[PDB]
Structure formats: C-alpha cells, structure tokens
Amino acid sequence: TDVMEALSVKEEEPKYGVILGFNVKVNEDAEEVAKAKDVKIFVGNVIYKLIEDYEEWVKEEEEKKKREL
Amino acid sequence: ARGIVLEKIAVEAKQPNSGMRKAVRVQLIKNGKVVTAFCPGDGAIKFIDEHDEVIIEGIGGPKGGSMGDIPGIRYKVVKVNRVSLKELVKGRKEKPRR
Amino acid sequence: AIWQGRSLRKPSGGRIVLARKKRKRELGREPSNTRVAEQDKRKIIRTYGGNKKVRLTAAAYANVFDKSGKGRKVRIIRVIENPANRQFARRNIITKGAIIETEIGKAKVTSRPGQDGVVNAILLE
Amino acid sequence: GDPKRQRKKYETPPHPWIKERLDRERVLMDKYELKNKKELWKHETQLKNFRRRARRLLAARGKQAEIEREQLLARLKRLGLLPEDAVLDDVLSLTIEDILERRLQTIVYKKGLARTMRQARQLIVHGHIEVNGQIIRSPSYLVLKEEEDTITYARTSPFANPQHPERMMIEKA
Amino acid sequence: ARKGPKRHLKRLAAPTSWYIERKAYKWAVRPRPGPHNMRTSIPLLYIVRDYLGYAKTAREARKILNEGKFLVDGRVRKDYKFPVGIMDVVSIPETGEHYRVLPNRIGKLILHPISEEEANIKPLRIRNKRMVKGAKIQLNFHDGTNHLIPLSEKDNYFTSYTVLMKVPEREILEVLPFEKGAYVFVTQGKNVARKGRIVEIKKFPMGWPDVVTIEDEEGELFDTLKEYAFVVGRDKPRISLP
RNA sequence: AUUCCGGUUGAUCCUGCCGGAGGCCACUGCUAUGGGGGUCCGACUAAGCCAUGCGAGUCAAGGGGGCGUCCCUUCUGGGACGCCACCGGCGGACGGCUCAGUAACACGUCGGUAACCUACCCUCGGGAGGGGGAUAACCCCGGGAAACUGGGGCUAAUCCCCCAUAGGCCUGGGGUACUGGAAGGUCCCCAGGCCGAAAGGGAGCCGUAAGGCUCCGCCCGAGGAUGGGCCGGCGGCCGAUUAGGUAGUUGGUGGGGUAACGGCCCACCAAGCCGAAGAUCGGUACGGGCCGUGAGAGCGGGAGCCCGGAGAUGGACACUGAGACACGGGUCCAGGCCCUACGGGGCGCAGCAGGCGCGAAACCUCCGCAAUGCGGGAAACCGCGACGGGGGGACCCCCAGUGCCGUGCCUCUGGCACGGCUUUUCCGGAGUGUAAAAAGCUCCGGGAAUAAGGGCUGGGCAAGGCCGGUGGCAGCCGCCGCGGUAAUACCGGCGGCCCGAGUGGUGGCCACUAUUAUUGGGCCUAAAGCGGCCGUAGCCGGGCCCGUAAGUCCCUGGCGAAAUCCCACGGCUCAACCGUGGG
RNA sequence: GGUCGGGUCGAGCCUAGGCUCCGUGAGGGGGGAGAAGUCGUAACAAGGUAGCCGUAGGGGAACCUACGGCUCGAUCACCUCCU
RNA sequence: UGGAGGUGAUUUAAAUGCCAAA
Ligand SMILES: [Mg+2]
Ligand SMILES: [Mg+2]
Ligand SMILES: [Mg+2]
Ligand SMILES: [Mg+2]
Ligand SMILES: [Mg+2]
Ligand SMILES: [Mg+2]
Ligand SMILES: [Mg+2]
Ligand SMILES: [Mg+2]
Ligand SMILES: [Mg+2]
Ligand SMILES: [Mg+2]
Ligand SMILES: [Mg+2]
Ligand SMILES: [Mg+2]
Ligand SMILES: [Mg+2]
Ligand SMILES: [Mg+2]
Ligand SMILES: [Mg+2]
Ligand SMILES: [Mg+2]
Ligand SMILES: [Mg+2]
Ligand SMILES: [Mg+2]
Ligand SMILES: [Mg+2]
Ligand SMILES: [Mg+2]
Ligand SMILES: [Mg+2]
Ligand SMILES: [Mg+2]
Ligand SMILES: [Mg+2]
Ligand SMILES: [Mg+2]
Ligand SMILES: [Mg+2]
Ligand SMILES: [Mg+2]
Ligand SMILES: [Mg+2]
C-alpha cells in the first residue's frame, strides 16, 4: 500500500513520489509492484548516506529534464 | 473493496434531467485498477480529499450495474478513513487526522 | 525403483496422471539370475509380514526324479537351452522350464530357484 | 454435505403491508395482549401444522396411517381443543382463537386470578402462579386440560393470603 | 488408517446392537479381538457399568473386575475390553445371579435371568469341520473355539448341528441334529428372536446361501437363512428362552 | 397462499424483458437489559512465512549400579526403606490438522479372493534340553566455539550367538479321510533336498530343609477374531471454433518378481485395442451420508458433525518394524532463513495458543486429567493443547424484561395528578453447585427503582394535501419518475406507519418465471420451418392364432451404518435440547 | 565401512527446435454515448424518380444505375375471375 | 352487395425548422 500511495502522490508531483527506508526490509510483492510501475526506493542504514542519495538522484533528474530540452 | 482517491470529477445527468453529480476516481489496492465511484449525500464531496482511502461497494441498479440518471458509474463510497460517510454528512462525528 | 503398482495407460490408449505416491508394499526386487558354478550360494530375504524367502544365486547340484518316484542328487554340467530368454543358455542361467544336462542325462527344471532355493528337475526320455 | 442447522419455528407473512391482514392481526394483538407479532405468528404456525397433518391423513391408507390418525386425535383432545367424541373432519374447522384461548395468560385471566390480561402476564412473570404444584414463568405455555383446575397462587406468594390489599381488589370484580 | 490399524472408536460409529447413549460423550470402548464378532458382542465394561449398574464410573468398574468378581463361561475375566456375545453366560457368584446374553426382538443385546442348574451348559453351533494331523477331526464353533474328536466318531457331527457343552470343563454332553422337526431360534435378520420348528430346506447354485422355512407356535410360516437358525432342541427347547 | 403488482400509447389489446414483494448464506452502517441449548468463529485471497511454551509416554514383580535413612552383629558386612539415571520391554503407523493434487476402480452399492498378509486377543493340541559372548551404567584421560564425539579398565539380564530336537517350504510317486456349488487346498504312506524355536524367567506363602501351591510370563502347530491389500458388474460434470487415438500399445506362449493374481516387468510370436451411443485432448473440481429453496415435478451447493481418499516447503529415495517409504525419525537436489571463534553446524506450526503478511472478511501466548477414551503396568496408578472447564464474539435456535391496579382530568388510543402493589431484571448477603472456580438454582434485606432503537412517509406499498428553508441549483430516484420562486416526492421541524433487541446497505443461490416447458411453452403477420428433394443409423410402426417370459405387475428372503427428517410418550420449569418406541 | 570394475533405475542441469500465456508497443480499424460544429435531404403521403431482396459497377455522404424477383404499393380508365 | 387479379397511363421547378416550453 505504501507503493500505491507513492504512485498516487507521484501522479501530480514527479519529485515527491519516493520511499526512503531506514534499516527496514522490502517485501517481494512491494518490490515487484515498484519495478512494474517504476517507483524509486532508497534503502539504507545511515541517515546522511541515505539522504544524500535522494538529493543527488533528484539533482540528476532535474538536469536530465533540461538535457533533452 | 478498498481503494485510494486520485481525483475529483463531476458528471452530467442524463437528459432530460439537469445537474452535476459528484464522483471520485479510485485506484484499487487489490489489483491496481481504476474505477469511478459516486459520493451520496448533500455536500458530501467536502469530506473527501485527494490521497484519502475509501471503502466502495455496488450502487444497486438493475442486473448489478448502474442506476438512475448516472450511467457509467457502478459504485458508491461507504467509508472515508474508516469513518462512515453517512455520519459525516448528518453530523454526529468528525473526520479524523484533520 | 521397481514398482509393480499399475500401468499408466488406459486400454483405450489415453494417459493416466498419478494421484498419490508409491506405497512401500508395491515394490519388487532385482531378479536373481541363478548361474551354474562349482559351489552353491544362497541368501535370505525378510519379506512382508516378517516372513522369509531363500534366494539361490549359484547352483551346483540338482535333484532328479524318474517316473517310478525315486530321486538322486547329482551335479549340473551346463544349460542346453532355455525358452524363457534368447540368451540365457549362453550365460548358463537356470530358471523353471530350462533344460539342463547332468551326469545321468538331460532334465527339465520344475521348481523356481529364486523363490525356493533348490533346483528340482524331472528326467527326460 | 452440510451438518444440521436449527431453523425457526414460525413463518412470516408473504407481503408485509396488506391492509386487511394488518387490521385483523391488530384486533387479535390488542385483545390478547401479546408482546410482538412473532408471538402471534408462532401460534399461527402451530395451527397450520395441525391442519397440514389432517389433510395428509385423509388421503392415506395402510397400517401406519391409522396409528398416526388416532395419535393426532388423542393429542388434539388432550390439549383441550376438541371434544372427546370428535372425528378427524373436525380438525379442519379449528381457528386461531381456539389456540390463543389455551395460553396460561388467558386462562389465568378467565379463572379470576387477575382483573386484566396485563396483570395476569405480570402475575405469571414475577412467579405468583403455580400449575400442578410447580411454578411456571412462561405466559405462552399451553395448558393441558387434565391440569387446568390445579392452577392457583403459589403457596409462598404474597397473594396467597385472603387479606392482601391487591388480592382484595382483584376479588372485588 | 493411513499407515496402520485403528485403535479408537467414536460413539456415533458404534455398533447398532448396543444399548448406549450416542451423543453423551465423544469416545466409546473399542473392543479387543476375542470370541465373537463386532456385530454380535459387547465389551464387558458396559455390562458392568451401564447394564447392571454396579458401578458409576469406569475407574471403579475396573476395580471390581480386577478383584475377580465376574465369570464368563465359568472363567474369570479381568479385561474390560473383553467381548461378551450370543449364548454366553454371565455369573456373579458373590450375589449368586446368572444371566444369558440374547438378542432382542429389535436386534439389541439383553441379559435374561436363568437358574443355576442351567447355567452350567452352553450351546455351540458347528460352524466348520476339518482334518488335522494324526488324522483327527477338529470342530470349529460359532464363537471361535475348537474341539478335537477321534476318527471313529466322525459321522456323528456335521455343520449346523448344535453341541451342548459343559463349562468350564468343556466336555460334550449332547448332540442336536439339524433336520425337519428341530426346534430353532433366529439370531439375525428381519425375523430375529422368533422361534419355532423346521419345515423345509432349499438350495441354490453357484454359492448362494441356502434358506429354511420355520413354523411358529401360532401356525405362521416364515423364511430365513440357514446359518441364522440356531438349533436348541429336538421338539422342545433345552434352554430357557424369552 | 398451487397468487400477483409497476413500466412501450393521445387512448387499447398483445408479445417480451426489466423492477417490486419471500427464504437462506458472506461482508458491513447505526443501536443493544437477561438467561438457556447447540455439531458456530484465518474455509473463499497466501498448501504464504514463523520467536517462545506446550501437543507421547510408561514399566522398580526384566538387570546390574550410585546416593540417603534406620536394624543386627558391625574392624568387614548383611538387611529393610526411598530416590536417580542407564541397559532391556511395549508404544510412538492411532489420535489431531488442512483440502493442494486427482475426472481415477478416488467414491457409493452389490458381490469375489479356491490369488493374500496380520503384533496385541480367544479356544484346543504340544514343547521349554546343552553351551558361548560382548557391552552401557560405573573408574582413568580427553578433543571441539559449539553441534557432537575418541581411547583404555571392569560387569548383568526376559540382551546377543551357536548345537540338538520339534517345526516350516519346494518337487516326484501312490492312497481316497474332510469341507464345499465346485479342489492348483486340508489328511495318510514312501523318496531327494533347503531353512530351522524357546526365558521354567520373575513375585509371594507353606517350607528346618527337602519341595510344593498359587500369580504373571517364553516357543511351535490348527482355527477364529481384529485391521487391511487386491479384483469385478452397476451409478453420478462442462466443451466439436477439440475427429481420429494407441506401438508394451491389445492378445498369446515361456519366465522373473511380489504377501498375493495381473504387461506389473522381460524374451519371442501375431495385429490387435478404443471411437459421433463422443474416443483423444482441454476446463473445472476431493467423493458420499446430507444442506438451501420450491405445491410438487425440479433447480442450486457440498467448509464445520460421521464414513472413505490424499498431503506434511517443491521433487526424488531408503533404514527399522506385525504395520511407514513415517507431520513433533533419516539421505540428496532446488528454494528460503538462523548461529559461528569462519574451521563448521542447524530449522520449515496445513497440532493448541500467539505474531507478521494478504485481504471486505475470522478469538486467550488461560485451568484440569475429576468425567469420556487411548498407550504402559500384575495392580494401586502415571501421561495426554485428544477430550473436559472457563475467557473474547449482534454465529444459529428457544424463553423473558424495560412495570401493574384503582379514582379523577385531559387533545380520551394515550398523557398528567393522587393512593396502593409486585421485584422477572438490578445492588448487597447465606446455602447448594464445581477437580477448584464462575454461571445457574433455593432463601434473606433495599427499591419503580437499573433498561428503545432502526428504517420509511408521491405510486407499487401501510402511513401528512401541515409549517420553514432551496429555486433545473443543491439533491432524490431498485423501476416509474420529482426538482424551472405557491415542492404532499430534495433539506429540517411537528405529526403518522412497519417491525422491534434489533433494524437497514452491498454481493450470491432458489422462488417469482409455463423467460428452459417430462408434467408444461412457441415458430402466417411479433425471435423462430433448412431454397427443394432422395436416403444410412436412431425414434415411431396395421389385423388374427400359438409359444416364450426379457421388460412390466404381485408375494417373499439378504442388504442400502450412525447422525440428520416426521409422530406419540417420558427427563431438564415448558420449550430449544436429550432418551425409549413406530415410520 | 573405504577404493576400483561392471549392469541398471534416476530428480536436476545445459543446448537446439516447435507450440502457448502475461507486460509494453510506433502505426492502423471500425463500435458506443454526447449534441449550441458542418454539408446535403435518403426514408415515412403517389414523401414529390413507389419502396424493398439477390448480384455487379459507380459516387463527398446519405445514395444512383443495369438484370431477375416480391407487395410489406397510391390514383384513374378499361378487361378478367368470383360471392 | 362485397372482394381478388391483369394491362395501360399519370404536363417544369418546390430545400429546411429556427425564438419557445423551462
Ligand atoms: Mg465435503
Ligand atoms: Mg408499440
Ligand atoms: Mg475450518
Ligand atoms: Mg491460510
Ligand atoms: Mg498418522
Ligand atoms: Mg482444489
Ligand atoms: Mg536350529
Ligand atoms: Mg462435486
Ligand atoms: Mg489464534
Ligand atoms: Mg466474520
Ligand atoms: Mg420529512
Ligand atoms: Mg396507501
Ligand atoms: Mg425477475
Ligand atoms: Mg413465450
Ligand atoms: Mg421451406
Ligand atoms: Mg424460409
Ligand atoms: Mg427421407
Ligand atoms: Mg400392432
Ligand atoms: Mg420378467
Ligand atoms: Mg441411517
Ligand atoms: Mg418437568
Ligand atoms: Mg414435551
Ligand atoms: Mg435423540
Ligand atoms: Mg426524398
Ligand atoms: Mg422516394
Ligand atoms: Mg452513374
Ligand atoms: Mg419539413
């Protein structure tokens, strides 16, 4: 259901539909649905090592938005 | 069934009636499909917001389908965030989580 | 290994899908190919219900009976022929119905060595 | 298949809003002071069962049929619904009022124990009435004819005293 | 019984010839192998506790049995699973009472009081007969027990005859042949517990069982299987029957 | 109750479908005082994954030891008495759980085995003679992170192994004693072989001793019983937009193997076997007793209780045993997961509780072996999440309450004011009840005190032509239809109707429906007679006479478990429920 | 119990080919609702050329034309066959 | 009196439905 909620938020906001898991586990059905619907998930164990990954992915998406523009 | 609200819409009545009927788009949790559900009651659409979860059921028309002057809509909303919608419309209860 | 339960074919030719595992009480065992040898050798098998079978694996003597009802214990030379299998005679395999040659003439086996543990034969004329 | 499930002992009307049926049932409910419709419906079902057994046995022949025929007549006239010389045909002329007259509440009212139907109901429920030496607290119990005359105030009740104020008012009518 | 023998018995599946309340509890006593078969016998515990009523629970019933208070065919039985069957004798010497076990008119087992003089004999139907080593004859009875006779006497005994045996010594004292005019008692079937005299015998091809005709006291004739007809006398019964 | 009502027109009669009105099952809104009975509660999606505790033991009257307490003499010891583990015996193959697979001799029913196995138990007939051997426990030393595991010393048995005799099995030649419908069977006599028993053990009294006298036991044979294996005839789903299928395939002869018959498996010889009366292939499904509904004929379902089958993460395979290819026993592969000192080692709750996940959808990490049974024991007894007892729950059914009486007044059904009464129910006590409790039941004290909701209100369809808001907006509407500034139809007030501890919403099946038609429908113009004809299987077939007895009808034997259904009588206060009889 | 030799049964694994299911998918095709866009007026009266069936050709679009058929075709005059 | 058929003919051009009803 978390992936469903994330997709609902992503429907109208591309940059705010994402999941940040801190020392948790991802179920088989959840990862299958995320792969099918192309939703990004960042799993980690360190707070800064997890936040910086999301920041840099957002920056890469931002630059790719205008790279082909 | 249980689903998540994607957006609010309005549907015109069939001729010769006049008016707009308040509905929502719902994505089902069990299989990911998208359906349309009617919101019964006077002013009921105010208690629905985007990203809420709802419980829906059939609307009760002939042969288990649509009814009245709204063809194309087969379901109606029953609960919102685990609170009965009929209560909210009458009063007697207030929607949680603000 | 050796399952004697049922065939997987219907008499019309269609196939049968097995609906259970193989039960233990339906298994068979390796055939004993009783050969001619210099010295006899037999073993004992514990069977269903806790019974026993004597299995003869190498035969050197035989019991021969005449039409008068007397018997003699003599030794076996070779297997002349065996109608059960085309190549039993060359390998000297003894089964019921085989023709063996002895020191007092040819004889036809009347017992089942793999089930009884002895070779009995009636004399031929 | 499926194991046994216990079923209801009464039947509901085929149409809930029929004017004539509502009028008739209201008359009965008010006269005999029943609590709800299902109580009434219970008694109706009893009557129908009796009728359904009589219709089946008129058309039967054999040895078991005669046994069941005499058993039906004996049970009917043990309850006080038929005279001791009645025949099978007389089963088909029974009405609902005949059964409602056999309730313990109605009989307590008719014998003079209470002034009203409602007072009789309360007298029964609170445990002031004894039947054949035993206290019964069900107002709908059907009274056998053989035990009708042993119906009195319980020997421990306040009312089993000719000087009690409420008993005297009952005697006054 | 996926892998082996059954050891339990539910009340609802119990034999239909017992007097027992089938919904009061879950389990019933599964009888031990023994003399008669399941359809014509009952365990001893029910006789002690339910029928005669000398015990309230099973535990105190087992205390009575372990002290040696009951005799079946004159022998002490201590096993509470032991089966008691048709034509057996139950004796309580401490109270001095004797019973014979018999089927009812509806097919259930009951205890019939008898005298002490008659309690020493037991009738046994000859179920089979064979040759045994040393050229002797072995007689196999309706309750499963066996007896030996010499080759000289071989013509006095045939199947369906009845032997009156003295218990517990097991010594023969009478032979009752099966023939026209014999007095019989029926032990199974629709005509169970009726009695009378033999009138006719009929036979059929290919292993179908043979049938007999019986006349009762009032003059009515009825048929039954030959093996359901137990001989009890020449022209009058030798034992007490209800 | 063997039933109708609304809807096609400006109006009418039809055909035809949709809707209303009834019952039952699952989920769910709002709302709830009490008791009793019962076969109710993670079945539908995930036969998905699981921490912790428990779900199978028992025997001191089979045997040697260790420790403790007392008595006699005790340098020692010998005794009794009680504990503890080990060797040894029996059991753990039943019971409990779930419904994935399976369209099949899986299941129901009638038969068969002269083609077979069976520890425990019952009866009758016999036997118990002579030798040998190790080893746990215990003492010395240990190894490894642990799981586990090494060497040396000594000892016993109802433990193990030999020898004899009884006994069993195979083949050839004779005899005719038994059962049976019928002997490849049983019995007797010769002859050639192969296999091959036993624990006179344990307890107690009389015994001065000699030795009896009971109690429990060991081995062989014949039969039964109990529990099964195997086989046959008949009976019960959907598809032709699946038409040909099979090659150990169908049969024969000779063998092997099995507890046993059999292409069950081999060697050789033939060309059979199944099919439009539906083979083969695909879909869906555990079968039945039964259950829901209906006037019946029928139509639909098969979780819960009983009987049968199958499975233990998926797939294969073995040891022990009377019985297993074994849910709380073993091995391999695949796939998950856990602990390591990194060298290795472990685990699958579709048992009772409990947790996560999935979903619209489902309970306490409780007490007891007192009852009913099972395993062990000579017995007394011991163990059992089976079963019994409670805890949570608008599961099903039965019986009740939320006051009653009199006199006045009122808008006279009802409401109010006076005076009285009762205590089911509620609060506090004593007894009985129970394994112990809790409920329940009998008494005592207080007091009308502690207790009504849900839907509907234009027609169908019972109930308002009242008032205030809104103004083709908002809303209602199963169907027909309302709402456009004077709404009996929307929102609210006040009235009224139905049912009532319940009452409404959604989805499914039966009825409605003679819209599946045997009973019992239609085809000129409304859906529907092949464009026409000839003919193979199938169905339907003229009159009389004689025979038969397959269908058909009547009478009678053996069967179709129990529970469930109907009736009377009896026990719980009556009932629901339970027992004895008849169907 | 180890090691080797032989015979036989076998889950799994790899390669090739042939069938079939699920997800995406450029491009294309008709169907159904909506009715304040557009061009015409084909069907109903003889609907202004009677309508319709089969076949074939043609045309922005409803449609038009040829051969054989049906009445489920209006009006007038004459003829035939009946009651 | 009321019906059923057959053969002939039938004199230019002439498309559409808006405000409403509410
Ligand atoms: Mg079932
Ligand atoms: Mg019309
Ligand atoms: Mg279940
Ligand atoms: Mg599950
Ligand atoms: Mg098992
Ligand atoms: Mg299935
Ligand atoms: Mg020996
Ligand atoms: Mg089925
Ligand atoms: Mg649980
Ligand atoms: Mg539920
Ligand atoms: Mg209103
Ligand atoms: Mg009305
Ligand atoms: Mg209908
Ligand atoms: Mg019709
Ligand atoms: Mg035609
Ligand atoms: Mg035609
Ligand atoms: Mg023809
Ligand atoms: Mg004829
Ligand atoms: Mg006939
Ligand atoms: Mg039955
Ligand atoms: Mg009573
Ligand atoms: Mg009664
Ligand atoms: Mg009963
Ligand atoms: Mg035109
Ligand atoms: Mg035209
Ligand atoms: Mg042209
Ligand atoms: Mg016009």
CSV table of C-alpha atoms in Angstrom, one decimal, chain D:
chain,number,residue,atom,x,y,z
D,1,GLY,CA,-22.6,-32.2,2.7
D,2,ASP,CA,-23.6,-29.9,5.5
D,3,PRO,CA,-24.4,-30.6,9.2
D,4,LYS,CA,-27.6,-29.6,10.8
D,5,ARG,CA,-28.7,-26.0,11.3
D,6,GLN,CA,-31.6,-25.2,13.7
D,7,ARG,CA,-34.5,-23.5,11.9
D,8,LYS,CA,-37.1,-21.0,13.1
D,9,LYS,CA,-40.4,-22.3,14.4
D,10,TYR,CA,-42.7,-19.7,12.9
D,11,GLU,CA,-43.4,-18.2,9.4
D,12,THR,CA,-43.5,-14.6,8.3
D,13,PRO,CA,-46.2,-13.0,6.0
D,14,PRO,CA,-45.6,-13.2,2.3
D,15,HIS,CA,-46.3,-9.4,1.9
D,16,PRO,CA,-45.6,-7.1,4.8
D,17,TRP,CA,-48.1,-4.4,4.0
D,18,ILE,CA,-51.6,-5.8,3.2
D,19,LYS,CA,-54.4,-3.7,4.8
D,20,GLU,CA,-56.9,-6.4,5.7
D,21,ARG,CA,-54.3,-8.6,7.3
D,22,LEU,CA,-52.9,-5.7,9.3
D,23,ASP,CA,-56.4,-4.9,10.6
D,24,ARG,CA,-57.2,-8.5,11.6
D,25,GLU,CA,-53.9,-9.0,13.4
D,26,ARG,CA,-54.2,-5.7,15.2
D,27,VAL,CA,-57.6,-6.8,16.6
D,28,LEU,CA,-56.1,-10.1,17.9
D,29,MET,CA,-52.9,-8.4,19.3
D,30,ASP,CA,-55.0,-5.9,21.3
D,31,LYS,CA,-57.5,-8.4,22.6
D,32,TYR,CA,-55.0,-10.9,23.9
D,33,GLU,CA,-52.1,-8.5,24.9
D,34,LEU,CA,-49.2,-10.1,23.1
D,35,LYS,CA,-45.8,-8.6,23.1
D,36,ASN,CA,-44.9,-8.6,19.3
D,37,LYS,CA,-46.1,-10.1,16.0
D,38,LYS,CA,-43.8,-13.1,16.1
D,39,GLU,CA,-45.5,-14.4,19.2
D,40,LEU,CA,-48.8,-14.3,17.2
D,41,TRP,CA,-47.1,-15.9,14.2
D,42,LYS,CA,-45.8,-18.7,16.4
D,43,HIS,CA,-49.3,-19.7,17.3
D,44,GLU,CA,-50.5,-19.4,13.7
D,45,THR,CA,-47.8,-21.9,12.6
D,46,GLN,CA,-48.9,-24.4,15.2
D,47,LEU,CA,-52.5,-24.3,13.8
D,48,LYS,CA,-51.3,-24.8,10.3
D,49,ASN,CA,-49.2,-27.8,11.2
D,50,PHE,CA,-52.2,-29.5,12.7
D,51,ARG,CA,-54.2,-28.8,9.5
D,52,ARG,CA,-51.4,-30.0,7.3
D,53,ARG,CA,-51.3,-33.3,9.2
D,54,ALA,CA,-55.1,-33.8,8.8
D,55,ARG,CA,-55.1,-33.1,5.1
D,56,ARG,CA,-52.3,-35.7,4.6
D,57,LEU,CA,-54.0,-38.5,6.6
D,58,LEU,CA,-57.5,-38.2,5.0
D,59,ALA,CA,-55.8,-39.3,1.7
D,60,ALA,CA,-53.7,-42.1,3.1
D,61,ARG,CA,-54.3,-45.8,3.7
D,62,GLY,CA,-52.3,-48.6,5.3
D,63,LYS,CA,-51.3,-49.6,8.8
D,64,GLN,CA,-49.1,-46.7,9.9
D,65,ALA,CA,-51.6,-44.1,8.7
D,66,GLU,CA,-54.3,-45.4,11.2
D,67,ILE,CA,-51.8,-45.2,14.1
D,68,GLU,CA,-50.9,-41.7,13.2
D,69,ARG,CA,-54.6,-40.8,12.8
D,70,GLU,CA,-55.5,-41.9,16.3
D,71,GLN,CA,-52.3,-40.3,17.7
D,72,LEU,CA,-53.4,-36.9,16.1
D,73,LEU,CA,-56.9,-37.1,17.6
D,74,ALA,CA,-55.6,-38.1,21.0
D,75,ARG,CA,-53.0,-35.2,21.1
D,76,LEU,CA,-55.6,-32.7,20.0
D,77,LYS,CA,-58.2,-33.7,22.6
D,78,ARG,CA,-55.6,-33.9,25.4
D,79,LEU,CA,-54.8,-30.2,24.9
D,80,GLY,CA,-58.5,-29.3,25.2
D,81,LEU,CA,-59.0,-28.3,21.6
D,82,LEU,CA,-61.6,-30.9,20.7
D,83,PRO,CA,-64.5,-32.7,22.5
D,84,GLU,CA,-63.9,-36.3,23.4
D,85,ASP,CA,-66.1,-37.6,20.6
D,86,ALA,CA,-64.7,-35.6,17.7
D,87,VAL,CA,-63.7,-37.1,14.4
D,88,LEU,CA,-60.8,-36.2,12.0
D,89,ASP,CA,-63.0,-33.9,9.9
D,90,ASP,CA,-63.5,-31.6,12.9
D,91,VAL,CA,-59.8,-30.8,12.8
D,92,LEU,CA,-60.3,-28.7,9.7
D,93,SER,CA,-62.7,-26.3,11.4
D,94,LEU,CA,-60.3,-25.1,14.1
D,95,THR,CA,-59.5,-21.3,14.2
D,96,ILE,CA,-56.7,-19.2,15.6
D,97,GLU,CA,-58.8,-18.1,18.6
D,98,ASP,CA,-59.0,-21.7,19.8
D,99,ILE,CA,-55.3,-21.8,20.3
D,100,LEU,CA,-55.0,-18.4,21.9
D,101,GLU,CA,-57.6,-19.4,24.5
D,102,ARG,CA,-55.2,-22.1,25.8
D,103,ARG,CA,-52.3,-19.8,26.8
D,104,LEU,CA,-51.5,-19.6,30.5
D,105,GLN,CA,-52.1,-15.9,30.5
D,106,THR,CA,-55.6,-16.2,29.1
D,107,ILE,CA,-56.5,-19.0,31.5
D,108,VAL,CA,-55.3,-17.1,34.5
D,109,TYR,CA,-57.4,-14.1,33.4
D,110,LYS,CA,-60.6,-16.3,32.9
D,111,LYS,CA,-60.3,-18.1,36.2
D,112,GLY,CA,-60.5,-14.8,38.0
D,113,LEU,CA,-56.9,-14.8,39.4
D,114,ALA,CA,-56.4,-11.3,37.8
D,115,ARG,CA,-58.5,-8.4,36.8
D,116,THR,CA,-56.9,-7.8,33.4
D,117,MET,CA,-54.8,-9.5,30.8
D,118,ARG,CA,-51.7,-7.4,31.6
D,119,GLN,CA,-52.0,-8.0,35.3
D,120,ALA,CA,-52.2,-11.8,34.5
D,121,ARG,CA,-49.0,-11.5,32.5
D,122,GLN,CA,-47.1,-9.8,35.3
D,123,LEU,CA,-48.5,-12.3,37.9
D,124,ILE,CA,-47.1,-15.1,35.8
D,125,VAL,CA,-43.7,-13.5,35.1
D,126,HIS,CA,-43.0,-12.5,38.7
D,127,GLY,CA,-43.7,-16.0,39.9
D,128,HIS,CA,-47.0,-15.9,41.8
D,129,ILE,CA,-48.8,-18.6,39.8
D,130,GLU,CA,-48.4,-22.4,40.3
D,131,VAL,CA,-49.6,-25.2,38.0
D,132,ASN,CA,-49.9,-28.7,39.4
D,133,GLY,CA,-47.6,-27.8,42.3
D,134,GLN,CA,-44.8,-26.3,40.1
D,135,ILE,CA,-44.1,-22.7,39.3
D,136,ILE,CA,-44.1,-21.7,35.6
D,137,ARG,CA,-43.0,-18.3,34.3
D,138,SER,CA,-43.8,-18.5,30.6
D,139,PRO,CA,-47.0,-16.7,29.7
D,140,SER,CA,-47.3,-18.5,26.4
D,141,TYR,CA,-47.3,-22.0,27.9
D,142,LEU,CA,-50.2,-24.1,26.5
D,143,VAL,CA,-52.2,-25.6,29.4
D,144,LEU,CA,-53.3,-29.3,29.2
D,145,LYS,CA,-56.9,-30.0,30.0
D,146,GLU,CA,-56.1,-32.5,32.7
D,147,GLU,CA,-54.2,-29.9,34.8
D,148,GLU,CA,-56.5,-26.9,34.3
D,149,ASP,CA,-58.1,-27.0,37.7
D,150,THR,CA,-54.9,-27.2,39.7
D,151,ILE,CA,-54.0,-23.6,38.9
D,152,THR,CA,-53.6,-21.4,41.9
D,153,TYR,CA,-51.5,-18.8,43.6
D,154,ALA,CA,-48.1,-20.1,44.7
D,155,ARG,CA,-48.1,-21.2,48.3
D,156,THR,CA,-45.2,-18.8,49.1
D,157,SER,CA,-46.6,-15.8,47.2
D,158,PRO,CA,-47.8,-12.7,49.0
D,159,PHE,CA,-51.1,-13.1,47.2
D,160,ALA,CA,-51.7,-16.5,48.9
D,161,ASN,CA,-53.4,-14.6,51.7
D,162,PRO,CA,-57.0,-13.5,51.6
D,163,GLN,CA,-56.2,-10.2,53.4
D,164,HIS,CA,-53.6,-8.9,51.0
D,165,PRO,CA,-54.6,-5.5,49.6
D,166,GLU,CA,-54.1,-6.2,46.0
D,167,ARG,CA,-55.8,-9.6,46.2
D,168,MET,CA,-58.9,-8.0,47.7
D,169,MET,CA,-59.1,-5.5,44.8
D,170,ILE,CA,-59.0,-8.5,42.4
D,171,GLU,CA,-61.8,-10.2,44.3
D,172,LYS,CA,-63.8,-7.0,44.0
D,173,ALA,CA,-64.5,-7.6,40.4
